[PDB]
């Protein structure tokens, strides 16, 4: 179970064989991946007024 938090439009980069900053610098998935990915919005708990 790998857990983290990212920006919005970058959620598409968490997939096998995808190109982007997150995929090539932070979190890379194998091309032969078997598993599942769950992504949901947390704008209420991770956002601050300041």
């Amino acid at each position: 179970a790998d857990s983290f938090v990212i920006r919005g439009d970058e959620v598409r980069q968490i997939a096998p064989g995808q190109t982007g900053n997150i995929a090539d610098y932070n979190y890379k998935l194998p091309d032969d991946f078997t598993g599942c990915v769950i992504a949901w919005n947390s704008n209420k708990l991770d956002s601050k007024v300041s």
Partner: protein
């Protein structure tokens, strides 16, 4: 007068030529060169065309 022998030669050449001509057919894919297939699109469909 020697056409019986010549045919034996000719049937060889054609058999090879046809084989070579099958290396430039797309078989329904985008192109015939596999390197461009690998360099253009994502692995999920690259596997299918390969």
């Amino acid at each position: 007068a020697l056409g019986k022998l010549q045919d034996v030669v000719n049937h060889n050449a054609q058999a090879l030529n046809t084989l070579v001509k099958q290396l430039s057919s797309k078989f329904g894919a985008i192109s015939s060169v596999l390197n461009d297939i690998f360099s253009r699109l994502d692995p999920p469909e690259a596997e299918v065309q390969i």
